[PDB]
C-alpha cells in the first residue's frame, strides 16, 4: 500500500519461536522480490520507539540543491583590432545539463524527472596580466544574459541588434550586485525530461550521429554579453551558472554511474586503469575472500 512515513519503523519485542511450517528467514530471490524477513523474526528484539526522521532524504531534498551546470570565461577587450571585424565581447552556450558529472550522476539516478529550474548566475572578473598590468580595480560592468529559444536569431557580436530582446527574455545584472536569479518553468514538450533516450532524433536513417540525442532536450541557447563598450585595458569575465531544481517528480530509478564519463552526448565508458572503478573491477581488491583489510588487532 501507500503509507505516510514521517519517521522510520519502530521495533517491537520478540520472543522464542520454534514453529513447524514457519520459515521467516527463508526466501526465494528468483521471484524478483526482496526478502521480507524482519528483524523481529530473525532475532529476539527489544521494543524501540524510533524517532529518526526521513525528511532529509526526500527526493525533493535530494535533488533540490544548486549545482554547477555551466562555467565559461571570455575576454573583455577590443577585438576589432587585426583581421577581426566583429567586436565579439560575448559568448553563446547551447543549454545542456550533462557537462559536470556531480549534478549529472545525481540526475541519472532516475529515468524521468519533472522540475522547475531555479537559475543563479555568478559573475567573476579579473584583470589580465600583460606588460602594463598596473592594477586599478575591477570595473562595475553590467552584463546581459538573454535566453534564445530554438529557431530565434542568435547574436553574432556584442553590438548585434538581437540584443534588444523584444520577445527573448533577458536579465541585466551588474558585477557588484547579488547573483542574478530567475526561474525557468518545466519547459519540456513531454510530461517529463528524459535523462536517457534509447533511440534516434531524426526520421531519416543515417548511419551514425543521432543515437541517444533526445528530440525534446533541445532547450536552446544562452547568450551572455558585456553591455559596456571596451575599456582601454583587457579583463577576463567568468560566468558560472547554478541550477537548482524544484517541485521535483522522479520516476524509474536506475543503477548509479560507476565508470567515469567521457562525453556529454553518450554513455560511453572506459573506467580507470585499475580498481576501483575499472571496467573489470568496480570495487578494490583484497588479498582473498577470507581477508579483512581493516581488522582490529587484538
Amino acid at each position: 500500500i501507500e503509507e505516510v512515513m514521517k519517521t522510520v519503523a519502530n521495533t517491537v519485542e520478540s520472543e522464542i519461536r520454534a514453529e513447524l511450517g514457519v520459515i521467516p528467514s527463508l526466501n526465494a530471490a528468483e521471484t524478483g522480490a526482496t526478502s521480507n524477513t524482519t528483524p523481529e523474526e530473525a532475532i529476539q528484539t527489544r521494543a524501540v520507539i524510533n524517532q529518526h526522521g526521513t525528511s532529509e532524504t526526500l527526493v525533493e531534498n535530494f535533488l533540490g540543491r544548486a549545482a554547477l551546470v555551466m562555467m565559461k570565461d571570455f575576454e573583455y577587450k577590443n577585438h576589432v583590432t587585426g583581421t577581426q571585424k566583429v567586436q565579439q565581447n560575448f559568448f553563446k552556450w547551447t543549454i545542456n545539463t550533462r557537462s559536470y558529472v556531480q549534478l549529472r550522476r545525481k540526475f541519472e539516478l532516475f529515468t524521468y524527472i519533472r522540475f522547475d529550474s531555479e537559475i543563479t548566475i555568478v559573475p567573476t572578473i579579473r584583470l589580465y596580466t600583460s606588460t602594463g598590468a598596473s592594477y586599478s580595480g575591477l570595473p562595475n560592468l553590467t552584463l546581459q544574459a538573454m535566453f534564445v529559444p530554438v529557431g530565434a536569431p542568435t547574436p553574432k557580436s556584442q553590438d548585434s541588434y538581437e540584443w534588444q530582446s523584444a520577445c527573448n527574455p533577458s536579465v541585466f545584472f551588474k558585477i557588484d550586485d547579488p547573483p542574478a536569479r530567475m526561474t525557468i518553468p518545466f519547459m519540456c514538450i513531454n510530461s517529463a525530461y528524459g535523462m536517457f533516450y534509447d533511440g534516434f532524433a531524426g526520421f531519416e536513417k543515417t548511419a551514425n550521429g543521432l543515437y541517444g540525442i533526445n528530440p525534446a532536450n533541445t532547450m536552446g541557447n544562452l547568450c551572455i554579453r558585456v553591455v559596456n563598450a571596451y575599456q582601454p585595458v583587457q579583463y577576463t569575465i567568468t560566468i558560472r551558472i547554478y541550477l537548482k531544481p524544484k517541485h521535483i517528480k522522479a520516476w524509474v530509478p536506475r543503477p548509479p554511474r560507476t565508470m567515469p564519463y567521457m562525453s556529454i552526448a553518450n554513455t560511453n565508458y572506459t573506467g580507470h586503469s585499475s580498481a576501483p572503478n575499472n571496467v573489470n573491477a568496480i570495487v578494490g581488491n583484497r588479498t582473498n575472500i577470507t581477508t579483512m583489510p581493516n581488522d582490529i588487532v587484538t
Binding site: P149, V150, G151, A152, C167, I189, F203, G220
Partner: protein, 99 residues
Amino acid sequence: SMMEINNVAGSSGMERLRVEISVQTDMDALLFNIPLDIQLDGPLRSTLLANIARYYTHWSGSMEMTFMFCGSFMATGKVILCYTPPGGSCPTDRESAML
C-alpha cells in the same frame, strides 16, 4: 491567409500566390505538394498563422488548409488532397498517397 505554394524562380509577386491547374494528358497525375513546415522557408511561411506562430517555439493542435478554384464556370474537375503523417518520404504516386 494565402499560401505561396508557387514559390519558384520565375514566379514574381502575385504569381506565387496561385497554382496553375491545367488539362492533363496523363491520369493520376501529381499536381503539387506543400511542405508542412512553419520554421523553414516554405509555402506556409507567408500565412498569418506562420507569422504569429514564429514568435513562439512550441505549438500544438490541428491546422486547416482551404483551397479555392478560380477557373471558369464550364470547367469541371476532381482532385484529391492528401496529408501524410511523418516517418518516410513524400508520396509521389496517387496509390501511395491516398493511404
